Amino acid sequence: SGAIYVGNYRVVNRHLATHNDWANLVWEDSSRDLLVSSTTAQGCDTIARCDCQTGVYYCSSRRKHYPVSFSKPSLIFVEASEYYPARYQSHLMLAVGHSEPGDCGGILRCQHGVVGIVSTGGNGLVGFADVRDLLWLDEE
Numbered sequence: 001s002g003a004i005y006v007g008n009y010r011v012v013n014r015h016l017a018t019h020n021d022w023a024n025l026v027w028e029d030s031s032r033d034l035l036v037s038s039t040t041a042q043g044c045d046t047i048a049r050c051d052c053q054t055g056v057y058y059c060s061s062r063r064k065h066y067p068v069s070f071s072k073p074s075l076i077f078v079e080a081s082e083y084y085p086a087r088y089q090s091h092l093m094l095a096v097g098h099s100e101p102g103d104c105g106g107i108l109r110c111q112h113g114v115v116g117i118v119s120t121g122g123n124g125l126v127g128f129a130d131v132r133d134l135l136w137l138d139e140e
């Protein structure tokens, strides 16, 4: 589990979005595993605006943050997980690291801020849903 709290937006994995999220929906995209909802209180996070390929992510299944190198966001085939069938996911970055389903929502960060959230795992990789292209998160 986990979210990004930027301005008055909550960014969650689409597959972990709650009824309140859907009832306060700003934007969602199944192909990216992302959903954004409204918040009453302003959040503490800053979104990275960069093309970094190194950062640090939180792995809840290890209670640890790990430094990783990651691929640029792309359209990637993802094998079946407990929460999605095998399918293509867009805007996905991969690193070598540990990720189980419950790790979804952990933040990947670089020197510029939040890069994305854990979205995929298995076979010794962790996949992150990028948010750095979502420039509208920084206003309004």
Ligand SMILES: COCc1cc(C(N)=O)no1
Binding pocket: 020, 021, 024, 037, 038, 039, 040
């Ligand atoms: C004026 O409150 C609007 C509102 C409600 C919510 C919510 N419940 O998620 N977020 O913003």
Ligand SMILES: [Zn+2]
Binding pocket: 048, 049, 050, 051, 052, 110, 111, 112, 113
């Ligand atoms: Zn960066």
